[PDB]
Amino acid sequence: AMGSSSVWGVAFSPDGQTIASASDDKTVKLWNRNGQLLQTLTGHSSSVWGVAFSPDGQTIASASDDKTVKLWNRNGQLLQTLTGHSSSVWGVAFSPDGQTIASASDDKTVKLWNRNGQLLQTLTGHSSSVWGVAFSPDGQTIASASDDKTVKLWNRNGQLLQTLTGH
Amino acid sequence: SVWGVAFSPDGQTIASASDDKTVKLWNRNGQLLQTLTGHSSSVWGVAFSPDGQTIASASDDKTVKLWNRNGQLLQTLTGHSSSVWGVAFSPDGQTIASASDDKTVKLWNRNGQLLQTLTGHSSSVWGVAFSPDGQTIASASDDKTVKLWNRNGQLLQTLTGH
Ligand SMILES: [Zn+2]
Ligand SMILES: [Zn+2]
Ligand SMILES: [Zn+2]
Ligand SMILES: [Zn+2]
């Protein structure tokens, strides 16, 4: 049971029957495998950059230029808005159980959240915009990638474990 | 920039594309275990097989290399005409998919044989993934599209950004 992340540019649902895509109009669209539109997720007030399905398949996360991450159910309903980043959010990922969300922001931080929208941790250390984030299968360990040309590995108590590329 | 890190199935090994033409294997505590040496240019993408025993690496040298977990080079997959950015294993581990600057995705077996070339993206393909059942392949491109393909290399659908 792996995490799910926006970093590969594809967000299949766990059964592969639904696919989520960031649209060019501040929306996320859900499609079936035949290219038919199922849901438009409306609510972001600026560009949507990253999307992920929870491994539960019931929740979708979207990262936006409007500095928020939004959580949606599969039937298109907005569930939560995760606020706290001070700049664009580029990337979003779910832990393998779907109960933790990680967000990667232009504000140089990764933030970790629960599904009720509560901020759990801020990972600070990157000297530049953080564009990518992903969980380990153990669900304890997090990788982030930044324009500072480094990749950092963290615990979910927010301690830096290693800088894997770069310095 | 593309994503350069992959987890083993249990999370106890982490592969990362290094800035020195190598892949490095780390344990979960950040300790270096192995360096995979052999690519002749930058390494951009890595993946683990579902059994955790094979690692794939995608390189600016236009190849994908397959390695065992103890650091030994198993195969070099040759055929892309430009940088390879991304690499993925199918859920059964028997197929490898590669995403290239040459605007194609290629599908390979573990013995290094080219099975299919997926053409249709109008620009560099940076990301590729299999569906969970392994019957559909998804690719993401600088042409701002995501395309869904079957295993025979037929384009099924394009998500366009509308
Ligand atoms: Zn260096
Ligand atoms: Zn790009
Ligand atoms: Zn449109
Ligand atoms: Zn449009």
Residue numbers in the entry:
A (entry chain A): 0 to 166
B (entry chain B): 5 to 166
What do the authors of the reporting publication say about this deposited model?
β-Propellers offer an attractive model system to study this process. They are toroids formed by sequential supersecondary structure units of typically 40–50 residues, each consisting of four anti-parallel β-strands. The units are arranged radially, with their strands perpendicular to the plane of the toroid, and have a right-handed twist, hence the name ‘propeller’ for the fold and ‘blades’ for the repetitive units. Since none of our single-bladed PkwA constructs were folded, we turned our attention to another highly symmetric β-propeller of the WD40 family, found in the C-terminal part of Npun_R6612 from the multicellular cyanobacterium Nostoc punctiforme PCC 73102 and referred to henceforth as WRAP (WD40-family Recently Amplified Propeller; ACC84870.1). WRAP, which we identified during a systematic bioinformatic survey of β-propellers, was particularly interesting in that its 14 blades are practically identical, having acquired only 10 point mutations over 563 residues (6 of these being Trp → Arg mutations at the same position of blades 1, 3, 6, 10, 12, and 13), as a result of 13 non-synonymous substitutions at the DNA level.
The 4- and 5-bladed constructs assembled into homo-dimers and the 6-bladed construct into homo-tetramers. As we anticipated from their oligomeric states, the 2-bladed and 4-bladed fragments formed 8-bladed propellers and the 3-bladed fragment a 9-bladed propeller. The one formed by two 4-bladed fragments absorbs the tension at only two interfaces, leading to an even more pronounced oval shape and a clear two-fold symmetry.
